[PDB]
Amino acid sequence: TKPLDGINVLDFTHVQAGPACTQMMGFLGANVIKIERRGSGDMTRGWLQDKPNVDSLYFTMFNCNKRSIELDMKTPEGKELLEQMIKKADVMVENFGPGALDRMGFTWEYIQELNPRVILASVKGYAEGHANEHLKVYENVAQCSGGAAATTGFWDGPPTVSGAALGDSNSGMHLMIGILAALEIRHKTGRGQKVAVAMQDAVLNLVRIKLRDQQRLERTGILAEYPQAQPNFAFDRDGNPLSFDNITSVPRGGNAGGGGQPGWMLKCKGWETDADSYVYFTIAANMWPQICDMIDKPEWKDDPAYNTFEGRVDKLMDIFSFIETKFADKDKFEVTEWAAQYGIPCGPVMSMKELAHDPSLQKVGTVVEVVDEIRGNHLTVGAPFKFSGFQPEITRAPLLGEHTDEVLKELGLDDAKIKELHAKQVV
Amino acid sequence: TKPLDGINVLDFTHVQAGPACTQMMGFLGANVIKIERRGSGDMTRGWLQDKPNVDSLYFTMFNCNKRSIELDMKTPEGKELLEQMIKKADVMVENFGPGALDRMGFTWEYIQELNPRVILASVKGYAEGHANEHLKVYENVAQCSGGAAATTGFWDGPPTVSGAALGXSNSGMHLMIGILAALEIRHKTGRGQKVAVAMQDAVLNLVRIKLRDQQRLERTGILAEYPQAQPNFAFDRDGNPLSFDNITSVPRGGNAGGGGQPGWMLKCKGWETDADSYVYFTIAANMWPQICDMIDKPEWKDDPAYNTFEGRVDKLMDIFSFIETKFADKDKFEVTEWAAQYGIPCGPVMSMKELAHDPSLQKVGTVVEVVDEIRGNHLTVGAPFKFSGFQPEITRAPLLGEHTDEVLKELGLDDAKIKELHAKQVV
Numbered sequence: 100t101k102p103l104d105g106i107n108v109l110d111f112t113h114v115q116a117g118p119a120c121t122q123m124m125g126f127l128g129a130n131v132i133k134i135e136r137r138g139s140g141d142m143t144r145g146w147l148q149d150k151p152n153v154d155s156l157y158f159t160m161f162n163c164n165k166r167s168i169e170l171d172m173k174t175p176e177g178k179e180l181l182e183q184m185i186k187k188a189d190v191m192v193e194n195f196g197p198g199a200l201d202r203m204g205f206t207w208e209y210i211q212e213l214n215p216r217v218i219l220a221s222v223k224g225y226a227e228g229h230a231n232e233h234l235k236v237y238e239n240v241a242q243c244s245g246g247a248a249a250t251t252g253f254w255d256g257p258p259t260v261s262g263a264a265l266g267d268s269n270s271g272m273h274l275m276i277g278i279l280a281a282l283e284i285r286h287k288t289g290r291g292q293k294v295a296v297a298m299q300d301a302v303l304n305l306v307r308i309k310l311r312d313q314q315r316l317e318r319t320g321i322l323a324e325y326p327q328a329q330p331n332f333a334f335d336r337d338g339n340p341l342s343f344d345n346i347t348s349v350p351r352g353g354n355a356g357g358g359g360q361p362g363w364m365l366k367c368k369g370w371e372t373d374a375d376s377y378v379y380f381t382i383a384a385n386m387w388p389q390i391c392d393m394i395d396k397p398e399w400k401d402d403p404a405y406n407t408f409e410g411r412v413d414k415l416m417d418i419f420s421f422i423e424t425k426f427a428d429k430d431k432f433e434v435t436e437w438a439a440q441y442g443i444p445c446g447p448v449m450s451m452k453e454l455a456h457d458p459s460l461q462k463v464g465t466v467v468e469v470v471d472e473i474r475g476n477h478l479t480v481g482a483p484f485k486f487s488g489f490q491p492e493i494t495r496a497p498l499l500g501e502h503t504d505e506v507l508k509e510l511g512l513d514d515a516k517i518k519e520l521h522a523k524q525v526v
Numbered sequence: 527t528k529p530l531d532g533i534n535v536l537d538f539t540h541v542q543a544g545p546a547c548t549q550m551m552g553f554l555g556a557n558v559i560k561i562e563r564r565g566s567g568d569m570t571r572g573w574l575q576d577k578p579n580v581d582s583l584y585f586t587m588f589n590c591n592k593r594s595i596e597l598d599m600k601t602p603e604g605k606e607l608l609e610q611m612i613k614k615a616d617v618m619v620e621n622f623g624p625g626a627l628d629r630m631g632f633t634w635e636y637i638q639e640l641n642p643r644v645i646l647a648s649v650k651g652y653a654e655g656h657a658n659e660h661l662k663v664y665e666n667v668a669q670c671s672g673g674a675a676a677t678t679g680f681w682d683g684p685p686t687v688s689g690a691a692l693g694x695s696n697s698g699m700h701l702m703i704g705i706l707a708a709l710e711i712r713h714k715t716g717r718g719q720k721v722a723v724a725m726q727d728a729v730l731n732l733v734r735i736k737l738r739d740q741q742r743l744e745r746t747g748i749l750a751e752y753p754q755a756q757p758n759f760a761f762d763r764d765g766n767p768l769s770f771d772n773i774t775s776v777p778r779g780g781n782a783g784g785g786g787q788p789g790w791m792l793k794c795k796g797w798e799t800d801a802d803s804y805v806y807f808t809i810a811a812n813m814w815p816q817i818c819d820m821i822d823k824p825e826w827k828d829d830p831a832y833n834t835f836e837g838r839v840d841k842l843m844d845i846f847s848f849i850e851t852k853f854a855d856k857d858k859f860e861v862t863e864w865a866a867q868y869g870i871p872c873g874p875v876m877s878m879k880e881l882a883h884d885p886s887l888q889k890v891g892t893v894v895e896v897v898d899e900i901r902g903n904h905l906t907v908g909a910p911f912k913f914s915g916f917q918p919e920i921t922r923a924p925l926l927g928e929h930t931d932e933v934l935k936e937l938g939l940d941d942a943k944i945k946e947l948h949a950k951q952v953v
C-alpha cells in the first residue's frame with residue numbers, strides 16, 4: 100500500500116545527508132531503526148535547540164518516522180547485536196567518516212556473508228578512488244568542492260553558498276535513488292549491492308548546466324546569455340571591466356537565468372524595507388510581442404535591435420531595468436498576477452514566513468504539521484513526490500533510546516540479557 | 527546487469543527537469559524512447575549552440591542514452607502510435623505545461639485503461655491543488671517560489687539564485703525517486719501509479735533547514751549563529767548595525783554555515799584576479815583545539831570566552847578575519863593541506879575550469895568524456911551514485927528523428943505504413 104512497506108532499514112545515519120535519506124524512506128513506508136550513540140545520540144539533538152531540555156527542530160525535522168536504539172558499537176556485545184540486526188535488514192545506511200564502518204569490522208565483504216540480500220548505502224564527501232576520498236566534509240565545503248560556490252553570487256563579490264542544502268539533503272536524495280535502484284535489481288538477482296554517493300558528485304550533478312557553460316566558454320570564448328556578455332555592464336570591486344575577453348572559467352552571473360530562459364530578479368514595491376519584495380521575471384525568446392504589450396513598447400516588436408535574443412545581447416540589462424520601473428507601485432503578488440495574464444514565467448520571492456503559513460503547501464501535504472505531544476507540534480517538509488495510490492503518514496521523531504528495549508525484544512532477547520546489556524552499558 | 531535493464535520509458539520530456547530524470551534512468555540501463563516535435567525537436571537542440579546547425583551542449587549533456595522519434599501528437603495517427611507505445615511502456619514521463627497531456631486525450635484514467643501496469647510521472651511548476659497550479663515555471667522562478675532565493679545571498683543585497691539547478695535537475699532527480707518508488711510498489715500490486723513532483727516542492731525539500739530556522743525565529747525571536755546576531759558586524763542600507771529585533775522571516779546570511787557548525791568564505795592568494803581563490807573554513811566546536819594549533823594561538827584554548835560556541839558568538843567574524851590573514855600568501859590548495867593535517871573541515875572553492883579537467887572526477891566516472899562520432903566528443907556528468915555490481919555505459923545523444931523508422935518497425939509497421947506517416951507529416 101506504501102512503496103516501502105516491509106522494507107527494513109538499519110539506519111546508522113546522523114547529521115543531515117544520511118537522516119534525510121532514511122526519513123524520506125520512512126515517509127514512503129520503510130521500517131527505520133536508527134542506531135544512536137549512548138547518552139548524546141545524533142549530534143543534531145543538541146544543535147540549535149529552541150527550548151532547553153528539548154530535541155532541536157534540526158533533529159525532529161530530519162528524524163520523523165524512525166525508532167531510536169542506543170548502542171555502543173565498539174563493544175563485543177554491540178557488534179553481536181549488529182550482526183543480528185543486519186540479518187533482518189533490507190538496507191543499511193551510513194554517513195560516518197571514510198572507513199569508519201570498516202574499522203568496526205563491518206566491511207562490505209563481511210556484510211555480504213552475514214546477509215546476501217542486504218543493500219549497503221553510504222554518503223561520503225568524495226567518491227572512492229578520489230584523491231580526497233579520506234576527507235571529512237560538511238555542507239558548505241561540499242558546495243565549494245562541486246562547483247556551486249564558484250558559480251553562485253555576483254561577479255563583483257565572493258563565491259557564495261546556497262541556502263538550499265546542496266551538500267547534505269541533496270546527497271541524501273541522490274542516495275535514495277541509489278537505494279531504490281539496488282532494490283529494483285535485487286528482484287532479478289536476489290542479491291544486495293553496495294551503493295555510495297559522494298557529496299561532491301551530488302553537487303556536480305545539479306551544476307551540470309555550468310559544465311555545459313565551461314565547455315561553451317572553452318569552445319567559443321563567450322556566454323551570450325550572461326550579464327558579462329553585455330558590453331560595459333559588469334565591473335569588479337575596483338571598477339575594472341568584466342568581459343569574456345579575459346574569462347576562462349564560468350563566472351558568477353548574479354541573478355541571470357541559468358538553465359531557464361534569460362531572466363532577472365526585479366524589485367517590487369517595498370523593496371527598501373522588505374528583503375523579499377522581488378519577483379523573478381523571464382524574457383523567453385518566443386514571448387517578445389507579449390512583453391512589448393505588457394510594458395507598452397509596441398515600437399520594440401518589429402525592431403531587430405529588440406525582437407531577437409541576438410539583438411538583445413547588448414542591452415538585456417537595460418531592458419530588465421526598464422521593466423522593473425513598471426513594478427514600482429505593485430507588490431510581488433500583484434506583479435505575478437499581472438505577468439500571469441500574459442503567460443510570462445514570473446513569480447514572487449516567497450519568504451520563509453510566507454511559506455511556513457501558506458495554505459496551498461499545507462493542502463497538498465508539502466508543509467505538514469507533525470503531531471508531537473512531548474515537544475509540541477512542529478512543521479516539516481513532507482514528501483515532494485505525490486502519488487495516486489497513497490499519502491505519507493508522518494509521525495514524531497523518537498526520543499533518544501525510546502525503542503531500545505522494543506527493538507531488543509524483536510531480536511528475541513529475553514528480559515535477562517536486556518538487563519545485562521543495560522548494566523554493561525551496551526545500550 | 528544494470529538496475530533498470532528492460533525498463534521501457536516512453537519519454538515526452540523536454541528542456542532540463544524531465545530530460546535529466548530520463549537520462550539518468552538511461553544511465554542505469556533503461557530503454558528510453560524520446561518523443562520530439564517534428565522539425566525542431568526538444569527546444570534545447572537549438573538553445574545556445576556552439577556550432578551552427580549542430581545540437582547544443584544543453585541538448586547532448588541531458589539526452590545521452592536515448593533514442594529519438596519525431597511525432598505530431600495532434601494528429602489522429604500520432605495518437606494511435608502513442609497508444610501502441612504506451613502498451614509497451616513501463617513508465618511514461620512528461621513535463622509539458624499544466625493540462626497539456628490531458629488535452630491530447632491521455633488523461634491518467636485513459637492511460638490506465640490502455641496499460642494497467644504503466645507508471646505516469648510528471649514534473650510540474652506547482653503541485654496539483656495549489657493556488658498556482660496552472661502556472662508555467664522555469665528554473666529560477668521555482669528557486670524563488672520554494673524559499674531558496676529569499677535565503678541565499680547577503681543581508682545587504684537582493685534575493686540570489688543558486689548556480690545549481692535547484693528548480694530543474696533537482697526536480698528531475700526527485701521525480702526519479704518517485705518513479706523507482708512506483709516500480710517498487712508495482713512488484714506488490716501489479717499496477718502502475720501516477721507520480722508527480724512540483725518544482726516548488728523539490729526546492730523546498732532542499733530548503734528544509736530554512737523552515738527549521740523560520741520556526742526557531744518565530745519561537746525565540748533570534749537565530750544566534752546568523753551574522754545579524756553578531757554585535758555590530760552586519761549593517762543595513764542606511765549603514766546601521768543589524769539585529770533580529772525587527773527580523774520576522776529567515777534572512778540572508780552571506781557565507782555563514784547554514785547549520786550547527788559556523789563557517790565563512792575566506793580569501794586566499796590571488797583572490798583579486800582569481801574569482802575562485804577562496805576556501806570555506808568551518809569552526810566546528812569539537813575541532814577547536816585543532817584550530818588553535820594551526821592558528822598558533824594557544825591563549826584561546828584555555829580561555830572560556832573562546833573555546834565555546836557562546837564564547838565565540840560575540841566575536842566570531844573577528845577571528846574569521848584573523849584566520850583569513852594566515853591565508854593571504856597561500857593558494858587555496860596550500861591552505862587546505864595545512865588544515866588537512868589537523869582533520870579540520872576546510873576545502874577550496876573549485877572552479878568549473880578545474881572540475882571539468884580534474885583527474886579524480888574522470889577516474890571515478892563522475893566527469894565522463896562521451897564518444898560522439900557525429901558532433902565530436904564532449905564532457906558530461908555521469909552517475910553520481912556508484913554501485914558495486916555495475917558501471918554506466920554512456921552513449922551519445924540522438925540526432926532528431928534518428929530512430930523514428932527503427933521505433934516504428936518495432937511497432938510492427940511495414941515500409942508502406944512508414945512512408946505514409948512520413949508523407950502525411952505524422953513523423
Ligand SMILES: *SCCNC(=O)CCNC(=O)[C@H](O)C(C)(C)COP(=O)(O)OP(=O)(O)OC[C@H]1O[C@@H](n2cnc3c(N)ncnc32)[C@H](O)[C@@H]1OP(=O)(O)O
Pocket residue numbers: 114115116117134135136137170171172173194195196197198199200202203222223224234235236237238266267268
Ligand atoms: S550532511 C553533512 C555531513 N557530511 C556527511 O554526511 C559526510 C560523511 N560523514 C562524515 O564525513 C563525518 O561523519 C562527519 C559528518 C564529518 C562527522 O565527523 P566525526 O568527526 O563525527 O567522525 P565520524 O562520524 O566518522 O565518527 C567518529 C568515530 O565514532 C564512531 N562511532 C559513531 N557512532 C558510534 C557508536 N554509536 N558507537 C561506537 N562508535 C561510534 C565511528 O565509527 C568513528 O570511528 P573511528 O574509527 O574512530 O573514526
Ligand SMILES: CC(C)(COP(=O)(O)OP(=O)(O)OC[C@H]1O[C@@H](n2cnc3c(N)ncnc32)[C@H](O)[C@@H]1OP(=O)(O)O)[C@@H](O)C(=O)NCCC(=O)NCCS
Pocket residue numbers: 540541542543544561562563564597598599600621622623624625626627629630649650651661662663664665693694
Ligand atoms: C517548460 C514549459 C514552461 C514550456 O512551455 P511551452 O513552451 O509553452 O511548452 P508546453 O509544454 O506548454 O507545450 C505547448 C503545447 O505544445 C504541445 N506539444 C508539445 N510537443 C508536441 C508534439 N510533439 N506534437 C504536438 N503537440 C506538442 C503541448 O501539448 C502543448 O499543447 P497545449 O496548446 O494544449 O498547451 C512547460 O513545458 C512547463 O511549464 N513544464 C512544466 C515545468 C517544467 O518542467 N519546466 C521546465 C523545467 S526544465
Ligand code: NA
Pocket residue numbers: 391392393394395
Ligand atoms: Na499594453
